[PDB]
């Protein structure tokens, strides 16, 4: 019967909540009350990358912390040299509604996708020197919202069909399917070890998956509205989620519950993007108020503001060496801050 | 090692030349979002404009040498609050409704127009509204089994507006039924419009040939109103 299953699920949720409350002896704020505040973080726009004609939805730094890919709603995927603002490649996309872009860790490939439900893989190191569509991954029944290369041959994608998928690029087939979200999966983040990843969906929930097994290891709630952004803490034992309820939150995989909420009363706009700095001390978040906020992750105090974007901040990336942070926006400009 | 610096310079110069050409192409095209329900006939509108798995369908047509790119959403879940933000900078949204929905999906269409009008990222986008099933609406009201008053009680005390221009050879009962539905969509538009975007209603049919011109004519008004605003002439 459906009813008895309803009470059984409710009782399971109740006992999970009771166990989580039992494990919650003290708050992270109480433990960190005796830590040194980071003061005021000041950053300046060192570079302004121009050349996109429409909204930027996605950026992704290279593993060399020098090149970066940017995806814009004019069918453009531009590789930039951030040091000199030089453009390396300008790939025209078949569909101009591109919501996500990825850069392969080896640097030989980029990926993109969006409202066409297709993940396009572009080879950057062709023998002739041009950039051609090396692969097209089809099978998602909703739009592509995020994609991250595990390596040159495997990629994990997030779709608006409430599912994530793991694709073997060479054969173009879905190696694995991750299901359990009920809303639109909006963002995925890959763990440093790459055996797990977290996904946040429109059901106001986050899920931790084992890449190899293909099963939902863990589920975290606490947000009130859609989760638009997610990122791991550098050590891989925690992750931050930004939502439309105008708050960011930090979750610990081992504690299995919420640790700290980053919100302010004067903030009434949702978070579009989140990112951690090199040590994980600073949590950067993009907003609809056209700004970015640098929060002290351990204390939940706004350490700084990045301002200079004329429209909604859609993108947020920190380099692997932690030298610079890049923000894309709906004003069609990329900004490199240091 | 400055030779590589020069090589990067010319690679950028070529890329930016191509980007200038692409910008010239991009700014001369009008992008349109086509919305509607299953029983609205917007697919027939696409077929008429063309002849005269995948998550989005695209349509190219030219009116008076001006290029239009109409985008129709397919193979997506009914939850549209996330992918609707991709169309915050289109020239217009073409909203198609079955005017003979009752006997009623008309109230569902009214709320669909309500969400588009008041969405924070679509506040600046004008809506071309197409009352589509006019031929089926005409026969329904004449049959005497329509009874629009049971779904909309305000139709009992409604009177045809003075500015209304009936087509020749049209029953007066059809005219007020036809115009009452338009005023239901117009009261949503008039509220909270604030002059930053407008609604252009049209009484269309399944196979009207002039549907390309109507989109062209409303896009001229939208673009002209935008330039006049930039000069504070409006």
């Amino acid at each position: 019967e459906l009813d008895q299953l309803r009470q059984e699920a409710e009782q399971l949720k109740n006992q999970i909540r009771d166990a989580r409350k039992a494990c919650a002896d003290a708050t992270l704020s109480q433990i960190t009350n005796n830590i040194d505040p980071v003061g005021r973080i000041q950053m300046r726009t060192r570079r302004t990358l121009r050349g996109h004609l429409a909204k930027i939805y996605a950026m992704h730094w290279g593993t060399d912390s020098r090149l970066l890919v940017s995806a814009s709603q004019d069918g453009k995927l531009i590789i930039w040299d951030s040091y000199t603002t030089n453009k390396v490649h300008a790939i025209p996309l078949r569909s101009s509604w591109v919501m996500t872009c990825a850069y392969a860790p080896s640097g030989n490939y980029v990926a993109c996708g969006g409202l066409d439900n297709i993940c396009s893989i572009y080879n950057l190191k062709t023998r002739e020197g041009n950039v051609r569509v090396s692969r097209e991954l089809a099978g998602h029944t909703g739009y592509l919202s995020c994609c991250r290369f595990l390596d040159d041959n495997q990629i994990v994608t997030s779709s608006g069909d409430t599912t994530c998928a793991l694709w073997d690029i060479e054969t173009g087939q879905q190696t694995t399917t991750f299901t359990g979200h009920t809303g639109d999966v909006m963002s995925l983040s890959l763990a440093p070890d790459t055996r797990l990843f977290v996904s946040g969906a429109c059901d106001a929930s986050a899920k931790l998956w084992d890449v190899r097994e293909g099963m939902c290891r863990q589920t975290f709630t606490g947000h009130e509205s859609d989760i638009n952004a997610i990122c791991f803490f550098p050590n891989g034992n925690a992750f931050a989620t930004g939502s439309d309820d105008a708050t960011c939150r930090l979750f610990d995989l081992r504690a299995d519950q919420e640790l700290m909420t980053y919100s302010h009363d004067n903030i009434i706009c949702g978070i579009t993007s989140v990112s951690f700095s090199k040590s994980g001390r600073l949590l950067l978040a993009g907003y609809d108020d056209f700004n970015c906020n640098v929060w002290d992750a351990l204390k939940a105090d706004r350490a700084g503001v990045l301002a200079g974007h004329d429209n909604r901040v859609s993108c947020l990336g920190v380099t692997d060496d932690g030298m610079a942070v890049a923000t894309g926006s709906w004003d069609s400009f990329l900004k490199i801050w240091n | 090692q400055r030779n590589e610096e020069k090589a990067q310079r010319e690679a950028n110069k070529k890329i930016e030349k191509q980007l200038q050409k692409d910008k010239q192409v991009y700014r001369a095209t009008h992008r349109l979002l086509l919305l509607g329900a299953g029983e609205s006939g917007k697919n027939t509108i696409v077929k008429q404009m063309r002849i005269l798995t995948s998550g989005i369908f695209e349509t190219k047509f030219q009116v008076d040498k001006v290029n239009f790119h109409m985008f129709d959403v397919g193979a997506q879940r009914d939850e549209r609050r996330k992918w609707i933000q991709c169309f915050n900078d289109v020239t217009a949204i073409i909203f198609v409704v079955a005017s003979s929905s009752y006997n009623n999906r008309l109230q569902a269409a009214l709320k669909l127009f309500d969400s588009i009008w008041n969405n924070k990222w679509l506040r600046d986008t004008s809506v071309i509204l197409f009352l589509n099933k006019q031929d089926l609406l005409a026969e329904k009201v004449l049959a005497g089994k329509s009874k629009i008053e049971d779904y909309f009680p305000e139709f009992a005390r409604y009177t045809t507006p003075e500015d209304a221009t009936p087509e020749p050879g049209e029953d007066p009962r059809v005219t007020r039924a036809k115009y009452f539905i338009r005023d239901e969509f117009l009261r949503i538009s008039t509220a909270s419009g604030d002059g930053r975007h407008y609604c252009y209603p049209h009484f269309t049919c399944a196979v009207d040939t002039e549907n390309i011109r109507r989109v062209f004519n409303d896009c001229r008004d939208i673009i002209q109103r935008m330039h006049l605003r930039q000069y504070e002439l409006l």
Partner: nanobody
Amino acid sequence: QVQLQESGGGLVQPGGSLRLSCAASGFTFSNYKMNWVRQAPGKGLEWVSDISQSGASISYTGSVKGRFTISRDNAKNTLYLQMNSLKPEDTAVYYCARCPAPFTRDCFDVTSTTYAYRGQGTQVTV
């Protein structure tokens, strides 16, 4: 977790009266526009009523004008639908729905098939 519990449904005589209560937990109730939606047997899911954060703005579907009253108590985090003079076509499952984002004028897909912020519903038989 966001949770909406609907109660008060049951079997009522035609022309009778009934009151549906929606207890909302897991979010700031006062920040959100609220809705009542319906699922009649053998057809789709339809929106019937909505109320804003304060209660100043109230709207109904045409078939329930002068018949249903939507009220909201932010202190007890609760929503009410007072149904007067029930008709046999009012027999349906009633779902208390929340708008996806706080203090927003638009409310997309609260009438969708698998909307997350919607309750399990209560059955009203007339």
